[PDB]
C-alpha cells in the first residue's frame, strides 16, 4: 500500500453543493493528477464513504520521481488547460453561472499521508481561487494514524472543514 517515506496527497474541495476528493501528485510541488477520474460526492456524504474515498485518492497519489515526468506533469499550458477544464466541469455539473459562484464558498482541505500519519489541514480561503496554509495554525491540523477506519478519516475531514477560514 503506502510506502515508507513516500508522500501521498489528496485535496478536498467543498462547496455547499459538492465535495470533490482529488488525488494530487508531484514532488514538493503537487498538482491535481489528471490520470484519475474526479471523485465527486454529495456535500452530505456519510463519513465512511468519504473516508474510503479519501484513502483511495491518497492511494492514487504519485511521487513524480522521474524528471521528465515532473516537467511534463507541470507544463504550464497543460496545467492551465487542466485547471480551466476542471472549473468548466464543476460549473457545468452544478450549474454555477460564474467562476465566482463556484469558488466563493469553496473550502479546501489538504490531506497528506506520510509514513504512519494522515495530516488533514484546514486552509485559509485567501483569494477566490487560492487557499493558503497561512493563518491556519499547526494546532488546527487534524492528525490521524494512517490505519484509522474510513469513518474516522471522514469524521476528521469534517472537523478540518469546520476549521477552514475564509474571506
Amino acid at each position: 500500500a503506502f510506502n515508507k517515506d513516500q508522500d501521498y496527497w489528496a485535496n478536498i474541495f467543498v462547496t455547499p453543493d459538492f465535495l470533490s476528493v482529488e488525488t494530487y501528485s508531484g514532488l514538493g510541488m503537487t498538482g491535481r493528477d489528471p490520470l484519475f477520474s474526479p471523485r465527486l460526492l454529495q456535500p452530505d456524504v456519510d463519513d465512511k464513504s468519504l473516508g474510503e474515498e479519501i484513502l483511495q485518492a491518497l492511494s492514487d497519489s504519485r511521487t513524480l520521481d522521474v524528471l521528465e515526468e515532473r516537467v511534463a506533469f507541470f507544463d504550464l499550458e497543460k496545467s492551465k488547460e487542466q485547471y480551466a477544464a476542471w472549473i468548466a466541469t464543476l460549473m457545468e455539473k452544478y450549474g454555477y453561472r460564474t467562476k465566482r459562484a463556484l469558488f466563493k464558498n469553496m473550502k479546501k482541505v489538504g490531506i497528506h499521508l506520510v509514513n504512519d500519519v494522515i495530516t488533514i489541514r484546514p486552509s485559509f480561503h485567501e483569494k477566490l481561487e487560492a487557499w493558503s496554509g497561512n493563518r491556519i495554525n499547526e494546532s488546527d491540523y487534524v492528525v490521524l494514524p494512517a490505519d484509522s477506519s474510513p469513518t474516522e478519516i471522514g469524521s476528521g475531514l469534517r472537523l478540518a472543514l469546520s476549521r477552514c477560514k475564509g474571506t
Binding site: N11, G26, T30, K108, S123, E129, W131, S132, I136
Partner: peptide, 13 residues
C-alpha cells in the same frame, strides 16, 4: 515544500 499554498490545480507543499 511548511505552509501550503493551493492555486490553479496546484499546491506548493
Amino acid at each position: 515544500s511548511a505552509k501550503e499554498y493551493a492555486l490553479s490545480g496546484r499546491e506548493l507543499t
